[PDB]
Amino acid sequence: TTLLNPYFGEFGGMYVPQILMPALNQLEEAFVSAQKDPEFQAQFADLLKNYAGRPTALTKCQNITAGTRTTLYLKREDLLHGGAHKTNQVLGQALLAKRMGKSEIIAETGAGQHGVASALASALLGLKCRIYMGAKDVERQSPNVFRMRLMGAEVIPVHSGSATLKDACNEALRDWSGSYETAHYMLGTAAGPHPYPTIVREFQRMIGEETKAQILDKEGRLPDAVIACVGGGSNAIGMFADFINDTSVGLIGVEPGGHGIETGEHGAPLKHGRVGIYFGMKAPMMQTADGQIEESYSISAGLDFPSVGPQHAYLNSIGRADYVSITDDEALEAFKTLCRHEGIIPALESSHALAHALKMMREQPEKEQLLVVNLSGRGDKDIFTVHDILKARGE
Amino acid sequence: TTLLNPYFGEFGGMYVPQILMPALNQLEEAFVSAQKDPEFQAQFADLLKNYAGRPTALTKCQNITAGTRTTLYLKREDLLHGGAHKTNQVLGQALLAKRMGKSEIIAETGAGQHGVASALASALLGLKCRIYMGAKDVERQSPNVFRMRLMGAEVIPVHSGSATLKDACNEALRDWSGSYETAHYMLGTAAGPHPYPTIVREFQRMIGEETKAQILDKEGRLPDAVIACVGGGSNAIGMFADFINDTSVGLIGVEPGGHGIETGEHGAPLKHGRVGIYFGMKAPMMQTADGQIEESYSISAGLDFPSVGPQHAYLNSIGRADYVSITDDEALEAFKTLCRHEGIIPALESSHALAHALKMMREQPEKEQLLVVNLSGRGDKDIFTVHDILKARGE
Amino acid sequence: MERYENLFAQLNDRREGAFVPFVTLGDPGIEQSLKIIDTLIDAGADALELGVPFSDPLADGPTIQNANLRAFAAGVTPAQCFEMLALIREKHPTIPIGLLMYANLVFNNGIDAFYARCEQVGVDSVLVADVPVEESAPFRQAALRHNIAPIFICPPNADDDLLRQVASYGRGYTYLLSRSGVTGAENRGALPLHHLIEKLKEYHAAPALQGFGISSPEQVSAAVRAGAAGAISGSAIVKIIEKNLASPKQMLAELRSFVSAMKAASRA
Amino acid sequence: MERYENLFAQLNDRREGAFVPFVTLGDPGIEQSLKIIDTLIDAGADALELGVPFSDPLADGPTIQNANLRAFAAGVTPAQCFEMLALIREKHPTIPIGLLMYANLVFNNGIDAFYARCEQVGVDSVLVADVPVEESAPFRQAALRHNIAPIFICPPNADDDLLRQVASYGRGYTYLLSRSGVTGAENRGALPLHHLIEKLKEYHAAPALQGFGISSPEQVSAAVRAGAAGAISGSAIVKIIEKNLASPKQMLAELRSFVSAMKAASRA
Ligand SMILES: O=P(O)(O)OCCNS(=O)(=O)c1ccc(OC(F)(F)F)cc1
Ligand SMILES: O=P(O)(O)OCCNS(=O)(=O)c1ccc(OC(F)(F)F)cc1
Ligand SMILES: C=C(/N=C/c1c(COP(=O)(O)O)cnc(C)c1O)C(=O)O
Ligand SMILES: C=C(/N=C/c1c(COP(=O)(O)O)cnc(C)c1O)C(=O)O
Ligand SMILES: [Cs+]
Ligand SMILES: [Cs+]
Ligand SMILES: [Cs+]
Ligand SMILES: [Cs+]
């Protein structure tokens, strides 16, 4: 029994060991209570404004759309404290943890941005934070490992499986199933068992709410499309939520295409996987013929996950949102282009969304279109990875 | 002849080779013209808001003042696009460069934050940017070197002298004296020949203006003191300017004490140097008995400079502002303390200001005082340096 | 069939508890796994709990994670597990056989077809580790249609509504969880909770088998004396496999010694 | 004294321009520097421009930056430069001697005391490189009080107000800058600007010496034919020092050859 619907059509649910059900129910009740609590809402709003820096800017690109009929704005979540959108919902969940009398936090991280967000919120709010991170990601997103540790978080490398986000997810959930009495699992994406996809969306929806107010102010109308990259789905659902009922507004989610869909080395289950049960949810996943979970791949650690949040699977199924993929090389070109022509260094995850928007423009350069890209994070964490690639490439 | 006063009491002036005087006069006339130009002001305001992210938050510390009568707020210039206050005045100067028909930019950088700011503004506004950086700083602030280059800026290591900020300054000025016909020198601090200390102050003064509005809103009164670190003086004068006429408001500038004033390895000329002429200005400087310019030292590249802006020398002389020093070890403790107790990773430069505020609190813990620290930048650029130190220290 | 019912009736007549080892099918290879299983049975196992190797076993600690990995390294697939199961049942007609499954392996090519395969090879129960009672409907329905017992979990902090649902929906045996966390021999299960054991009996639940962290004869005796119908041990058995990979004869001797001792303890 | 006035009157009588080498005092050491200077004079230098080593010479390119560094490596201080100057004047009573200074070295322990020291050793002019006419008052006042000529710079893009101020405030000679930028033999000065040369004469300015990038006899001839009273060469002379550090005799022979050729060119 739940207070809220755990499903989005066929997708979602609470596919966890029985031991964890009371924790999920407790979380859901605490969330419902907090959502109607003016003191909670005021505390959360104050942290977002005065600590995290909201509202974040909406920047019109000045150069990259030259010579086309595309007007492109970037929602600047890269300016949020911590350097990505992850910080928004971490502040809300940290307050819920406190509300439930918990004093410890478990989190998984891939890009290290959710881990940084979790560490910073725990330092601020007096929680003991431990973060699981795949060993491959400890290497390719190393600046975030140093940031997490300086903030007093324990960072636990995960060597099992693919040593990437799914494996950090597995360890976090294993840990929680033994420590839930004292630890809150601060899941960092719009995926996993209910109530997480719902809470994460509700604690990210200020992204789209602000976008709407800002585009109305600057353009006097809604966007033709809003475009966001999709790992587990939090930044995309945060951007999408407030536009769902605005039927004219296109919702475009961008999965990582890795080395190319045809190679099997990607992270695009929504369009190229099939429905399975894993990580507490029924959702599209990359799986073998026998139902073993496949290892994903992407140049970007934040997108390197073989599943996707169930609300995205649902929005796709009914045709309300469209999902596409962008390869590693397309993402890199978009990264370079934004650095050199707009003076913004984007996260490689966010560069997938940008790459798609650039494609929309370039493919149809006389199509009148007003687009918003969710610039989910800054690329400081990626600069060594990108440098090394461009040098090996002979640039 | 000038339109504006090049001096602050005894300090300042235009001590450059005769060849450069027309460039300085041209810059001054362009600045005066732009200051009364509503279109210029609107363009600058739009970039600050929609591109850089202003106004920046004013954060009340929740934990670090516990048990004392100190209320401490941090002015969050670490949230500005690029990661430091440097971005504010770069946007204004870049617009002046364009206004004067120049298409190239020269800048010096120490911490690499002014260089990053210069590179980003040049990418946005279509200027060809070259940045001089001391070779020691290329090493200890390396993340900023990668950021500058990804944005298409040329980064020129300077091996001469101390291979730090003063040496990058020397090369930038040498370059400008041959290239001024086509290049604007985007000096990054409130120092050098007139009109730079004036322009830099006027293009940074939004820091203190916003601070005042924000403290009035939250506290219903002015701060007892505002505290800022002082390299060449831009973030400090940006914070101070709007409070100069509020006689009750203490203005405290923090110079780097390095390994300790007594060792001679510091960057604190305002309090421990003597008046000299160098880098186009008459100002306090670290100099030998014979008048050779001494090499400075600080753990922080942004503060590692053997002089100081002439308006600070002036404010000190008349007792309107007080100047103090903070050692490397004091700065490091403040860095660690903010990371672990407020979930903010400060620049090591900004950590000098914070360290002083923490001292004010700790020395007199029952003194009622409302303080603002200018948190001039984020410490991403410092994380490898700080890690290496704390590990060598056995932590 | 009625293999659990017959087993428990026999154990009751002998005033004895069940000892039920867990292993991963095909660990360290198919042939050795079959020999291991025959050794477990010959040494006194009353029933078996058998793991199908799964890529991401979220209820298992490192010991059994590593069993799954050894099976995959030997190229074990669920199809090969079903071939093994057929061979085990062919040798051992009455021993109850329960599968430990993760949901995706059951859901993969159709829930109904999965349980139909289980019936064909003669499996008696299926425990789907990541499907709580709240999500169990199509699983328990398919199980019962194919004469398979769906096994549900009674955790230490089970409330009354949960006790009633587990008693109603489950068949074969009730899983009495020793503790929170994941499988592991080093993390010792708590003493069996008398109140849950008694409430399950009051609600006519399938007999309880205590599991998680049971690695010693003393814990088996404690479970039975507390009123549980028996105990399950996985990680302790698997460690004997892991320790003796280069010594297959010593492996079987140590498995036999351990299983015999754990079974002796079930008579307390 | 009147050493520049006497020199230019003599040069005019001979219908000849001046050749004025620059070196850094004490490069590569005090003794060798003194020999270098005697060699410059014996080879035909009409006047000297002499650098006091300074830590941050912002109007100088790498060649002269490196001269300053060699002098510092030899432990040269301004005090030792004044001792050298006294010795040079003692040997050579009439040759005009001009110092190239940076402001801090003049300002350091009092502007007046600096120019008083210059007078005592018999220096004729001081050029302070980073003090424009706009900041020059206390410098030119102190210079004139101590019978030292303050030298000012006429850049290529000098306007009329500047030409008038340089003509009025300067004495000894007027510096006619060849080009923008910093000192350097590789960056060749532009042809002397006839209009500036003629305007300076119209305003009764001290005679003009062209400098920056003059490294060949042809450029010396071009400066004189354009109406300048002579030319200064620094980096070209200094490179001969830098090239021959391990060969002090070859150094002086090459300095002599070069200076003789540059002086011959001043008669064109
Ligand atoms: O002895 P240990 O600690 O290794 O425990 C072995 C248990 N093996 S098992 O098949 O019964 C078993 C039973 C239930 C499990 O998860 C669930 F409770 F969530 F369903 C996992 C394994
Ligand atoms: O031959 P080069 O190119 O080395 O030039 C040598 C010139 N040496 S100097 O003392 O006359 C000399 C004169 C003026 C200088 O700077 C100023 F113009 F700003 F004042 C610097 C050096
Ligand atoms: C998984 C991680 N990051 C994901 C991420 C993503 C993708 O995750 P969502 O689909 O949940 O937004 C997008 N943008 C940025 C900057 C990100 O850091 C992490 O930091 O743990
Ligand atoms: C000199 C540099 N930085 C100085 C600096 C300073 C000191 O310079 P000002 O005194 O000009 O603010 C303070 N804070 C931050 C974050 C800084 O980066 C530079 O980035 O080039
Ligand atoms: Cs456009
Ligand atoms: Cs994904
Ligand atoms: Cs306080
Ligand atoms: Cs300084």
* Identity of the residue numbered D213: G
What distances in angstroms separate CA C228 from CA B125, C5, C159, one per listed residue?
77, 15, 18
**Distance between first and last Cα of chain A:** 58
Whether D181 contacts D189, CB under 8 Å = no
Structural domains of chain C in order of their starting residue, each with its CATH number:
1-268 (3.20.20.70)
Phi first, then psi: what are they for C126, rounded to 5°? -130, 130
Subunit contact B340:A126, Cβ cutoff 8 A: no
Q: In chain B, where do the E strands start and end?
A: 7-8, 11-15, 58-60, 70-76, 104-109, 128-134, 154-158, 183-185, 225-229, 250-258, 274-278, 280-285, 322-327, 369-375
Ligand 2 — pocket residues by CB below 6 A?
A: B 17; D 22, 49, 59, 64, 100, 127, 129, 153, 177, 183-185, 211-214, 232-235
Query: Residue C170 and residue C109: Cα distance in Å, rounded?
Result: 24
**What does the buried/exposed string (b/e) look like for D78-91 if buried means 16 or more CB atoms within 10 Å of the residue's CB?**
bebbbebbeebbee
Phi first, then psi: what are they for D15, rounded to 5°? 50, 60
Method: X-ray
Subunit contact B19:D54, Cβ cutoff 8 A: no
Q: Residue A337 has which token pair?
A: 């282009």
Residues in chain D followed by a break, C to N above 2.5 angstroms = none
Describe the strand order of the beta sheet including A280-285 as a list of residue ranges. Answer: A7-8, A11-15, A280-285, A274-278
Query: Residue D182 and residue B4: Cα distance in Å, rounded?
Result: 28
Nearest CA to CA, how far is C13 from chain A (Å)? 33
Whether B184 contacts B105, CB under 8 Å = yes
Residues of each domain in chain A carrying CATH 3.40.50.1100: 8-52+86-204, 53-85+205-390
> Length of chain A in residues, anyone?
395
- A19 Cβ under 8 Å from any chain C Cβ: yes
The DSSP secondary-structure symbol of B48 reads: I
- Close Cβ partners of C58 (under 8 Å, ≥ 6 residues apart): A17, A170, A173, A174, A177, A279, C102, C129, C130, C182
Q: Residue A54 has which token pair?
A: 């909201």
What percent of chain A is helix, strand and coil (3-state, nearest 5)? 45, 20, 30
Tell the burial category of A222 from Cβ atoms under 10 Å away from its Cβ (0-12, 13-18, 19+). middle
CA C22 to chain centre: 5
Whether C192 contacts C227, CB under 8 Å = yes
Greatest CA separation for chain B: 59
The CA C268 to ligand 6 mean position distance, Å, reads: 53
Three-state DSSP class for residue B260: strand
Q: Could you identify the residue written with the tokens 């103090």?
A: B324
| Residue of B123, B65, B80 lying closest to B371 (CA atoms) | B65
Half-sphere exposure of D74 (CA within 13 A, CB side): 23
Q: Is A81 a catalytic residue?
A: no
Q: Residue D43 has which token pair?
A: 């080879």
- Close Cβ partners of C109 (under 8 Å, ≥ 6 residues apart): A291
Residue nearest to atom 20 of ligand 4 (CA): B113
Q: Which of C68, C100, C238, C258 to mutate to test ligand 1, by most ligand atoms within 8 A of the CB atom? A: C100
Whether B312 contacts B236, CB under 8 Å = yes
Whether B17 contacts D58, CB under 8 Å = yes
**Residues of D with Cβ-Cβ distance to B179 under 8 angstroms:** 180
Phi first, then psi: what are they for B67, rounded to 5°? 85, 5
Q: Are strands A369-375 and A70-76 parallel, antiparallel or unpaired?
A: parallel
Phi first, then psi: what are they for B256, rounded to 5°? -75, 130
Whether C119 contacts C148, CB under 8 Å = yes
Query: Residue B95 and residue D216: Cα distance in Å, rounded?
Result: 43
**Residues of A with Cβ-Cβ distance to C182 under 8 angstroms:** 174, 177-178
Secondary structure in 3-state letters for D13-60: HCCCCEEEEEEECCCCCHHHHHHHHHHHHHCCCCCEEEECCCCCCCCE
- Close Cβ partners of D113 (under 8 Å, ≥ 6 residues apart): none
Q: Could you identify the residue written with the tokens 């997103």?
A: A141
Q: Could you identify the residue written with the tokens 């060949």?
A: D216
- A365 Cβ under 8 Å from any chain C Cβ: no
Q: What's the sign of the alpha-carbon dihedral A379, A384, A390, A395?
A: positive
Nearest CA to CA, how far is B132 from chain D (Å)? 15
Query: Residue B11 and residue B17: Cα distance in Å, rounded?
Result: 18
- Close Cβ partners of A11 (under 8 Å, ≥ 6 residues apart): A275, A281, A282, A283, A310, A311, A313, A314, A317
**Residue B134 pairs with which residues in a beta bridge?**
B158
- Residue A61 — left, alpha, or beta (φ > 0 → left; ψ -120 to 50 → alpha)? beta
Ligand nearest to the CA of B63: 7
Query: Residue A40 and residue A91: Cα distance in Å, rounded?
Result: 11
Query: Residue C215 and residue C185: Cα distance in Å, rounded?
Result: 6
Three-state DSSP class for residue D157: coil
What percent of chain C is helix, strand and coil (3-state, nearest 5)? 50, 15, 35
Q: What number of other Cβ atoms are within 10 A of residue C39's Cβ?
A: 18
Query: Residue A212 and residue A200: Cα distance in Å, rounded?
Result: 19
**CATH 3.40.50.1100 applies to domain A53-85+205-390:** yes
Helix locations, chain D, DSSP H: 3-13, 30-42, 62-73, 78-91, 103-107, 111-121, 137-145, 160-169, 194-202, 217-225, 235-243, 248-265
The DSSP secondary-structure symbol of D166 reads: H
Query: Residue B382 and residue B302: Cα distance in Å, rounded?
Result: 11
Q: Are strands A250-258 and D149-150 parallel, antiparallel or unpaired?
A: unpaired
Query: Residue D120 and residue D79: Cα distance in Å, rounded?
Result: 13
- A340 Cβ under 8 Å from any chain B Cβ: yes
Query: Residue D189 and residue D187: Cα distance in Å, rounded?
Result: 6
Query: Residue A171 and residue C141: Cα distance in Å, rounded?
Result: 32
Whether D23 contacts D237, CB under 8 Å = yes
Return the ∠ at Cα A388 (arms to A140 and A296), rounded to 5°: 40
The CA B232 to ligand 8 mean position distance, Å, reads: 6
Whether A170 contacts A193, CB under 8 Å = no
Q: What's the sign of the alpha-carbon dihedral A347, A348, A352, A355?
A: positive
Q: Which CATH number fits domain A8-52+86-204: 3.40.50.1100, 3.30.300.30, 3.90.79.10, 3.65.10.10?
A: 3.40.50.1100
Partner residue facing C103 (CB), from A166, A177, A277:
A277
What distances in angstroms separate CA D60 from CA A214, B168, D158, one per listed residue?
53, 15, 21
Query: Residue C89 and residue C95: Cα distance in Å, rounded?
Result: 8
